[PDB]
Each structure stands twice: as C-alpha cells, then as structure tokens.
Design an enzyme around this catalytic site. Sequence first.
Site, PDB file in Angstrom:
ATOM      1  CG  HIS A 184      -1.694   1.206   1.334  1.00 61.22           C
ATOM      2  ND1 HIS A 184      -3.045   1.546   1.060  1.00 61.22           N
ATOM      3  CD2 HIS A 184      -1.240   2.614   1.917  1.00 61.22           C
ATOM      4  CE1 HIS A 184      -3.360   2.767   1.469  1.00 61.22           C
ATOM      5  NE2 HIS A 184      -2.414   3.235   1.989  1.00 61.22           N
ATOM      6  CD  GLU A 185       1.559   3.590   3.570  1.00 58.50           C
ATOM      7  OE1 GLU A 185       1.831   4.415   2.942  1.00 58.50           O
ATOM      8  OE2 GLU A 185       0.831   3.520   4.487  1.00 58.50           O
ATOM      9  CG  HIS A 188       0.497   6.313  -0.769  1.00 53.75           C
ATOM     10  ND1 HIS A 188      -0.661   6.759  -1.148  1.00 53.75           N
ATOM     11  CD2 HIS A 188       0.344   5.717   0.600  1.00 53.75           C
ATOM     12  CE1 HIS A 188      -1.653   6.556  -0.444  1.00 53.75           C
ATOM     13  NE2 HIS A 188      -1.249   5.910   0.519  1.00 53.75           N
TER      14      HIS A 188
HETATM   15 ZN   LIG Z   1      -2.293   5.268   2.228  1.00 49.82          ZN
END
Ligand SMILES: [Zn+2]
Length: 391
Positions: A184-185, A188
């Site tokens: 997820h990170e 980004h």
């Molecule tokens: Zn996030």
Amino acid sequence: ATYQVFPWGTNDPSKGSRTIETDPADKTASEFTWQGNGKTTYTMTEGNNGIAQANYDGDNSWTNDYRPDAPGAKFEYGYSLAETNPKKYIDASVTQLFYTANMYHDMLHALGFNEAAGNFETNNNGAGGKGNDAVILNAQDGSGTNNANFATPPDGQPGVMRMYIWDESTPYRDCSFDAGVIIHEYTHGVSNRLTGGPANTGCLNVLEAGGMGEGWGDFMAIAIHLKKADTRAKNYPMGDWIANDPKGIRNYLYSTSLTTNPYTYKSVNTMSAVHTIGTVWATILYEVLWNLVEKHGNSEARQPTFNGKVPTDGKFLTMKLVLDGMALQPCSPTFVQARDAIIDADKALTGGSNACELWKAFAKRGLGEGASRGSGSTGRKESTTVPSGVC
Ligand SMILES: [Zn+2]
Ligand SMILES: *[C@H]1O[C@H](CO)[C@H](O)[C@H](O)[C@H]1NC(C)=O
Ligand SMILES: [Ca+2]
Ligand SMILES: [Ca+2]
Ligand SMILES: [Ca+2]
Ligand SMILES: [Ca+2]
Ligand SMILES: [Ca+2]
C-alpha cells in the site's frame, strides 16, 4: 543473497511461515541484484532499489541508523510472535521490509513502472529518468505508532517509507511483517509518480483523487495476494493481522457482493475522508480483477509472463491496466477519468479486447456509462449502464 522472510505471496505471519530465500532478485529488473547499485555491492540491507534501516530516531536521515550487516549478505535472523520487545527482532524487521519492497520494485518494473516511468532507484543504468531515488525504508520508525506512510517527491529525489509499531495488541505488531501495508505505502509512490508524470507529485490531493490514492494501494495488496484456489466469492480484509482485527481496517471487506460491501460511486457523495473513498475505488477494482481473472486466469507467479506486450493471466493483466491507466489519467483525476484511463489503457494494450469485462465491473458499482462527477461535494450521478456495442 539470502533473506529469511515471509515469502512473497504470504501476506503476514498468520498466513504462513518464514523461509530462507536465496537470490530472489529478478535479473532484468534488478540487474545489480538488490545488494548492488553499480558503484558498489553491500553486505548491509542496501542496494539499487532501497536503503533500509532501523530509523528509531524518526528523523530524515538514514546515515545515523543501525542497519543489518551480514557476511555474504545472508540476512538470516530470528523472529518470534511472542517477543514483546520489537527491537529484539529489528534485524528480521529490516530484512523483511527490504525483501518485500525489492520484490515489489521488481514486479512493478516488469509491468512498466521502470526507470523512464519515474520509478525509485539509485542508478537507472542508462534506461532514462532520474536516479538517486532509491526508497528510504525506515523500519520501526520512531516518529509514530499504529500507522505507516510514504512521501513522494518528484523523480530524482528519494521516496520515503516509514513503518511503525502497532500497539493495540500485546505483543505489539511490527508492520514490516504485513506485506500489504508495505505494498500500500509503496504504491503511493507509484501513483504519485505516474499521475501527471514523474516530475509532478501533487496530482492526488483533491479529495476524490486522494481517495483513489488510498484505493490503488489496497488494491495492489489484495491483487498480489490473490490465490489460485480463490473464487470471486472470496472476500479480503485490509491489514487484519497488523490491526489484530479480522475485519481489517476498512469499513467493509473487499468483495464482489453488493450486500457484503455496498459501496458504489454515489457513496462518495456522503464521504469526507480519503480512506473511505479509497475503499470504494479498491472495491471497484476488485470487481474488475475478478472479471479479468475469470477471463484470463489467476496466478501465483512472482513475475508476469507476456504474449507480446500483454500479460498472460488476468491478475497481472489487471495490474498492468491499472498502472497504465495511472500514466494516462489527468492530474487530479475523478473516478470517471480513472475509469476511462483504464479502458483506454486496454485499448492501447490489447486493442480493447477487455472492454466488456471492464465496463461490466465499472457499471456494477455505479461507474457505468452515464456516470458523472458533477460539481461540488455531493454532485455525483452514478450509473449501472453499459455502452451499447461492447458486450
Ligand atoms: Zn495510504
Ligand atoms: C530478464 O529476465 C530473463 C531471465 O533472467 C532474461 O534475462 C531476459 O533478458 C529478461 N526478461 C524480460 C521479460 O525481458
Ligand atoms: Ca535516522
Ligand atoms: Ca527515479
Ligand atoms: Ca534499473
Ligand atoms: Ca506524477
Ligand atoms: Ca502468470
């Protein structure tokens, strides 16, 4: 050269056990291995794609931190789910973070998030773009708890990931060991680089766009961990291990049932936070994923396989189309423009052969042909219609 980790495809310690992985780097995506950047080779958790360390100080420097240093780059360290002091397994923690991040770098690279696309590496080795931006991977970062985050500057400056300890359970849980959180990170970074081009990383700021910013990351985690035995009836939470909550951290499970997860585009009219909006978007993409996995097959492979430029199975096809869409959509995209970028990505990649499967998924949750962002915080008109001629 060895990494004792939960292997790729094992999201977290509840899903499997650790194993010693020998030389898992992909030779095309990581031509210097993970331990090299073409200037030097390291026996520490550092190399072309990531610089990983225990950033206990929580600061902006990665040169004042402990980093594992193993002869032969054999990062083989103990880890216990009963240990209450996370610093006792910091070596395993840094190793797991480095492994997952590098594996993800390698997969993304095969799917087109490469040097010229604005990816994160020290040495681009003549392939275009700007280097010196290997991801700073801060394990057990001191600056927070019960979270994680990623900072994305323009191409040529490092992305920065911070992984915190989560302390609502005892023993505390280290989110280095929750692969979906790392994914997820890191995503980004991917979506901020790709959206609006790699020089501009302020394109996912408007609420709906930041919402997709969250959803892409959840989606990529769920897609990576999709299993061949799953069917579309399978539901997945987000972060159920790190949060010690079987329902995960989102309001509803990712699901192709509208009862289990009722979110549609109209739901966004009563949302005010990127994480709920992101749940809507990742749920839409989960529908797409299952349509395309059914059409083209699932896979548990680490790297995609290609018929020409087109991935052979539906998992990597979906991920490719999602990434290609990020590079086509406008800055500050709406859901509708993000949808259109994905469909346009399939036109370019397969000549539009997946238009039916795409539109069915988008229409199912309110992003059909008549859908419109409208104006204002509550102006969206959803639609379940499918254009004539596609199916
Ligand atoms: Zn996030
Ligand atoms: C890199 O990986 C394979 C095997 O290591 C070959 O070296 C090939 O040159 C590259 N793979 C692709 C998909 O280009
Ligand atoms: Ca530091
Ligand atoms: Ca770069
Ligand atoms: Ca490279
Ligand atoms: Ca960008
Ligand atoms: Ca495959």
